[PDB]
């Protein structure tokens, strides 16, 4: 059984814990403690292949970026500042791992919210400039949660 080391990165409050817990527990956990950083392991079936996800939910080091095989770069669609930080996380990950091909997925979370300050073309344009997929999510409703993590595993399989 193949193990995939995933790392969830993004500004504080974008929903990294809410996304991780929704994948692990299938429950939306409101206002999870912002400083708690844990790794979770979960056996899943992705594209017919049973595998184990080893997911680090970061809380804001160079070690766990070197160990990570794929990275979820999360921003909230109602927080332009979190979207502008995205290129900082990609650059800092590309620096430690010394590679031009680090499996990565852009995640725009909180899509259940109407007051949207970052639109879809912006995010798609940034993701296309990186050569990485863009997945919309809501940890609250669980929309796109499995898609975001499963798409990252597929990116690791290409690599």
């Amino acid at each position, epitope marked *: 059984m193949t193990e995939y080391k995933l790392v969830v990165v993004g500004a504080v409050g974008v929903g990294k814990s809410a996304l991780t817990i929704q994948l692990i527990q299938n429950h939306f956990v409101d206002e999870y403690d912002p400083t*708690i950083e844990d*790794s979770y392991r979960k056996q899943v079936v992705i594209d017919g292949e049973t595998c*184990l996800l080893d997911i680090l939910d970061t809380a804001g080091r160079d070690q766990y970026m070197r160990t990570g095989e794929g990275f979820l770069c999360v921003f909230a669609i109602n927080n332009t500042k979190s979207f502008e930080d995205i290129h900082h996380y990609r650059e800092q990950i590309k620096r430690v791992k010394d590679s031009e091909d680090v499996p990565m997925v852009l995640v725009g979370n909180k899509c259940d919210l109407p007051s949207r300050t970052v639109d879809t073309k912006q995010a798609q344009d940034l993701a296309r400039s990186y050569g990485i997929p863009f997945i919309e999510t809501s940890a609250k409703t669980r929309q796109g949660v499995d898609d975001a993590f499963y798409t990252l595993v597929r990116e690791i399989r290409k690599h």
Partner: nanobody
Amino acid sequence: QLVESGGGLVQAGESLRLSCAASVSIFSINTMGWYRQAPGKPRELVARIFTGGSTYYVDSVKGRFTISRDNAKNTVYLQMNQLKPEDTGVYYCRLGADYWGQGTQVTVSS
């Protein structure tokens, strides 16, 4: 102030109940976890309980361990059944973000 107990030296297949008792009320604390560090390995999250009552267990202990909280007693528990040698390590309770127990030794012999 956390009082930790329940560890000890046991044989494989036996059971222990680890306990983590706080001097203060724990009702407002939303999540609790148990961690362990085995010899030669980094610290890992063994179990966590979340608001709403759902529980997570690392794959190596799923089906044998049970994490619970007793709010009226300000105590958090880890029931460990069918203990295996690989379960040997120092176990730490974590109440919320920064209330850590100072550890309890679990040693499982064959």
